[PDB]
Amino acid sequence: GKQYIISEELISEGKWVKLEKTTYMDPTGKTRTWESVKRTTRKEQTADGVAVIPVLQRTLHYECIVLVKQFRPPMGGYCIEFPAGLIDDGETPEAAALRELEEETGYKGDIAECSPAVCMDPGLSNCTIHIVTVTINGDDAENARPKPKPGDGEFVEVISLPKNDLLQRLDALVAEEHLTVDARVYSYALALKHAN
Amino acid sequence: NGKQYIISEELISEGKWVKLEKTTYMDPTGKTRTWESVKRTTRKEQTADGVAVIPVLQRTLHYECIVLVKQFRPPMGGYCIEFPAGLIDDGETPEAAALRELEEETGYKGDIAECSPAVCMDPGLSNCTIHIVTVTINGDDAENARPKPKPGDGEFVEVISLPKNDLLQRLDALVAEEHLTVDARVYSYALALKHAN
Numbered sequence: 581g582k583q584y585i586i587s588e589e590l591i592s593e594g595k596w597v598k599l600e601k602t603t604y605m606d607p608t609g610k611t612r613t614w615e616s617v618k619r620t621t622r623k624e625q626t627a628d629g630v631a632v633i634p635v636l637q638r639t640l641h642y643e644c645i646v647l648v649k650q651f652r653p654p655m656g657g658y659c660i661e662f663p664a665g666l667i668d669d670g671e672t673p674e675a676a677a678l679r680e681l682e683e684e685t686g687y688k689g690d691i692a693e694c695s696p697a698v699c700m701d702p703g704l705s706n707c708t709i710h711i712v713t714v715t716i717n718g719d720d721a722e723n724a725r726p727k728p729k730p731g732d733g734e735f736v737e738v739i740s741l742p743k744n745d746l747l748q749r750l751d752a753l754v755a756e757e758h759l760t761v762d763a764r765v766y767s768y769a770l771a772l773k774h775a776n
Numbered sequence: 777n778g779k780q781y782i783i784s785e786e787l788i789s790e791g792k793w794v795k796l797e798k799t800t801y802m803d804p805t806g807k808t809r810t811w812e813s814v815k816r817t818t819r820k821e822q823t824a825d826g827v828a829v830i831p832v833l834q835r836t837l838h839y840e841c842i843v844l845v846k847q848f849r850p851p852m853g854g855y856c857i858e859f860p861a862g863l864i865d866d867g868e869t870p871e872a873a874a875l876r877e878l879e880e881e882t883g884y885k886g887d888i889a890e891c892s893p894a895v896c897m898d899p900g901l902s903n904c905t906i907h908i909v910t911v912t913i914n915g916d917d918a919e920n921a922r923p924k925p926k927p928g929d930g931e932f933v934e935v936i937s938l939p940k941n942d943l944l945q946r947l948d949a950l951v952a953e954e955h956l957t958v959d960a961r962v963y964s965y966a967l968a969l970k971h972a973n
């Protein structure tokens with residue numbers, strides 16, 4: 581009944597990603613194969629990366645979610661995402677969240693909560709992240725004029741949409757700008773509307 | 777400030793289901809860069825590779841439930857809690873795929889509520905895209921009294937209905953209880969529900 585991995589064979593390994601053929605035992609006692617994807621960068625970390633839900637709080641204003649718009653070569657187009665990135669060797673999820681947030685948007689934030697490791701596309705890959713909810717005090721002088729510090733090859737546009745109408749604003753962006761919205765962002769947006 | 781685009785896409789390795797390409801693209805400064813990209817081989821004329829279904833089970837004098845599925849995922853080497861999901865067949869509408877997948881995996885006959893534009897699953901890694909299809913399930917209808925699944929070859933599914941009003945804590949309890957990974961879309965949905973109250 582219980583399924584498990586028998587063995588993994590490397591098909592192709594690049595600098596960043598690899599393709600494996602996975603042999604596994606199905607519930608009926610029959611062994612099957614599966615073409616799996618993995619990052620090559622995972623080490624002693626609980627997950628590959630962090631995604632940050634940055635809630636920007638200014639008084640006398642709506643709460644905003646801070647998103648980033650980037651060109652994504654795999655997608656061959658621009659995407660709207662939660663700020664995200666790899667957890668560095670020895671770095672905690674919480675710390676990687678704040679750093680990524682500051683690198684991509686400039687905002688200095690405070691941890692609110694940190695998810696367990698969640699899978700990005702379990703049908704395709706073993707990639708996991710921690711989803712980290714961060715509040716940004718946008719009345720602090722820190723965040724008055726936020727200063728992005730992007731690394732080499734990081735071209736990032738910051739986009740702050742209101743929480744209270746996030747789903748509609750995202751759909752407007754897709755129709756207007758012909759962007760692709762991230763699935764995690766859209767799931768979040770949906771739930772806000774579906775809450776009772 | 778210049779706009780970015782694909783220059784070329786060179787195949788590195790193609791399987792029956794997934795392949796790895798080397799993408800060359802132009803960055804904003806006018807310098808060419810490369811990227812190791814993942815793509816599914818099954819895509820054709822569909823607006824997306826697949827669908828994920830948010831099934832809201834509605835019953836009189838019961839709290840709304842979200843219907844999730846637990847499956848072994850070879851890439852993860854373990855069981856995962858996910859929204860019902862699969863590929864869109866050739867010529868199939870996303871809505872039609874959502875309903876089919878939900879009935880095959882769970883046995884529930886849903887009704888369409890809303891359907892998203894194509895959204896990306898992991899755009900830093902792959903081009904994989906889906907429509908997120910919100911579906912209501914009338915639990916009081918007799919068709920949905922005792923749902924009869926019908927999984928295809930190599931499909932092995934457990935149905936898990938958690939209340940909407942307490943989804944996040946119920947998922948936490950499931951992770952604490954056994955070795956399990958919650959899907960990122962599931963967790964993001966549950967987070968928003970909490971954050972909305």
Ligand SMILES: Cn1cnc2ncnc(N3CC[C@@]4(CCN(c5ccc(C(F)(F)F)c(Cl)c5)C4)C3)c21
Nearest residue numbers: 613614615703793825826827828861862863897906
């Ligand atoms: C069947 N099979 C055998 N070796 C394989 N080797 C590799 N893959 C396989 N599959 C079959 C098709 C799939 C089953 C689950 N799939 C899937 C599940 C979920 C999603 C969604 F919507 F969440 F994104 C999508 Cl797009 C697709 C397709 C991967 C393999």
Ligand SMILES: Cn1cnc2ncnc(N3CC[C@@]4(CCN(c5ccc(C(F)(F)F)c(Cl)c5)C4)C3)c21
Nearest residue numbers: 596628629630631664665666700709810811812900
């Ligand atoms: C830099 N680079 C050059 N060729 C490449 N070829 C391939 N890859 C690359 N990268 C670099 C690292 C990454 C940049 C964005 N990344 C990333 C972005 C998002 C997530 C998250 F958390 F959302 F899942 C994660 Cl885990 C990682 C890593 C992929 C390549």
Ligand SMILES: [Mg+2]
Nearest residue numbers: 640641642643
């Ligand atoms: Mg306010």
Ligand SMILES: [Mg+2]
Nearest residue numbers: 664665666731
């Ligand atoms: Mg980074």
Ligand SMILES: [Mg+2]
Nearest residue numbers: 664665683684
């Ligand atoms: Mg970054």
Ligand SMILES: [Mg+2]
Nearest residue numbers: 861862877931
């Ligand atoms: Mg299926």
